[PDB]
Amino acid sequence: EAFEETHLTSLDPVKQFAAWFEEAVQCPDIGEANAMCLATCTRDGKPSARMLLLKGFGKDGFRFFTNFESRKGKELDSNPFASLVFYWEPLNRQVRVEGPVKKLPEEEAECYFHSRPKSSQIGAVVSHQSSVIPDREYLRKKNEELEQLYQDQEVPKPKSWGGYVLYPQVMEFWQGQTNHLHDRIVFRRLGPMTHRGEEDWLYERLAP
Amino acid sequence: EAFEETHLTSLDPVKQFAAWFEEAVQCPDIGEANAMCLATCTRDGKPSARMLLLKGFGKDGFRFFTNFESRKGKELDSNPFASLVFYWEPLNRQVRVEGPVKKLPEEEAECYFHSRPKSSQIGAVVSHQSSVIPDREYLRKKNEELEQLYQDQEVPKPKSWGGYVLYPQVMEFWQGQTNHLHDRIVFRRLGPMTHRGEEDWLYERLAP
Ligand SMILES: Cc1cc2nc3c(=O)[nH]c(=O)nc-3n(C[C@H](O)[C@H](O)[C@H](O)COP(=O)(O)O)c2cc1C
Ligand SMILES: Cc1cc2nc3c(=O)[nH]c(=O)nc-3n(C[C@H](O)[C@H](O)[C@H](O)COP(=O)(O)O)c2cc1C
């Protein structure tokens, strides 16, 4: 029941995530375990957020793909800092991730783009993400038109579409309790309460 | 199936939300329909996000309660701008809300605080939200101690704890489709594509 520090799994939060992620996949009550909210803001400080999907994670951090000329793409391409929220309601858990964002290698994006379903690939070409359009049939038309063009061919990845990777600086692990005393263990990159994790990671408990 | 403009419900997005919110409550597959992600950032432009609960909504906007001396409280109390994401997975819908944030009346917060369960009330007093603490038993101790103190009494609302209201400037209604051509209708406070809604609201369709 109790989410303890001396319990846990790893003092590396990336490995601790992997542990928590696995349990999320294993829960049949969770649809998309990799569904996350991605928060960005302008250099000025105008925040925005939308749902994404995590597309792989590792030592380098957390990967996700989108249009660069989209609202969030522009926000990142002038203010490369992001936050992530994972929420698993049935497990009553939350993971918050913060850090700077590097654009992924071009040819790496090529590889992934071509592993997506055919329909998904074409969708990326019709859609200038977050741009004003006249009506819904506009999209439906251009889509069926591109289906004809890339009949028995492969869709070239548009220059607009690629990936990002968030290098984690801060990682919170939130475990809700019925007594309202939620367990919060936060990792960041010493005082009597601050402890050392793996590498340059430090962890401490926060009040709920 | 198709989320149309000439379908919809109201040209007032607050009323359109009410319509979408009601369907979320009615769905038995949705636990907390009012569960939302709240994105804030520093004046500098350092974004952060966490799950909250919506606690009422109306003409004035969207209300939610927290500690003001919390991380997000401070971010708001120096940069009163926020974003909200509602995600209803079974309905495959997303609502994004953006606008400035006013702190709620003190006595209004008093009223609400005292309508929360006894345990919840005490929880607000033990917990200096987002502050470093030594261990989990620390909380558990102080909590049981305050239970003795407020035996057959009422908990005074701490000065730290209160509410906020986000006055909506932008409101996106996202409806996912299997063909990847997600319907996006965005309201904001004229061109050939921009249409007029109720009051000073304008709406347009965005590419997915
Ligand atoms: C569950 C879910 C997953 C999503 N995943 C992605 C994604 O991986 N990439 C993406 O570009 N948009 C994704 N979207 C759509 C975004 O929420 C958003 O509508 C779009 O990226 C435009 O964001 P922007 O207006 O902030 O640029 C997803 C939406 C939902 C509901
Ligand atoms: C479903 C859910 C609902 C929550 N609702 C609230 C809430 O209404 N108010 C609140 O202060 N924290 C709420 N929390 C906790 C926050 O996510 C977060 O841990 C806390 O507010 C500290 O935020 P901060 O560190 O950004 O200040 C909720 C958490 C979850 C998972």
Author numbering:
A (entry chain A), B (entry chain A): 46 to 234, 243 to 261
Reproduce, without paraphrasing, sentences from the article in which this PDB structure was first reported.
The enzyme pyridox(am)ine 5′‐phosphate oxidase (PNPO), whose catalytic action yields PLP, is one of the key players in this pathway. In humans, the different B6 vitamers, introduced with food, are interconverted through a salvage pathway which involves, besides kinases and phosphatases, the enzyme pyridoxine 5′‐phosphate (PNP)/pyridoxamine 5′‐phosphate (PMP) oxidase (PNPO) (di Salvo et al., 2011, 2012). This flavin mononucleotide (FMN)‐dependent enzyme, which produces PLP from PNP or PMP, plays an active role in vitamin B6 homeostasis. In both human and E. coli PNPO, PLP works as a regulator of its own production because it binds at an allosteric site of the enzyme, affecting the binding of substrate at the active site and inhibiting the catalytic activity (Barile et al., 2019, 2021). Mutations in the gene encoding PNPO are responsible for a severe form of neonatal epilepsy.
On the basis of this previous experience, we carried out co‐crystallization attempts with either the wild type or the R225H variant of the human protein and PLP. The R225H variation affects a crucial active site residue involved in substrate binding, but is able to bind PLP at the allosteric site and has allosteric properties (Barile et al., 2020). We obtained crystals with both protein forms; however, PLP was detected only in the active site of the wild type protein, thus a clear indication about the location of the allosteric site was missing. A substantial part of the N‐terminal end is not visible in these structures: the electron density map starts from Glu46 in the R225H and from Ala47 in the wild type structure. PLP binding at the allosteric site of E. coli PNPO results in the disorder of the large structural region made by residues 123–166 and also uncoils a short helix (residues 192–200), which contains Arg197 (corresponding to Arg225 of human PNPO) that plays a crucial role in binding the vitamer substrates at the active site. Our crystallographic analyses and the results concerning the proteolysis of PNPO N‐terminal region indicate that this region of the protein is very flexible.
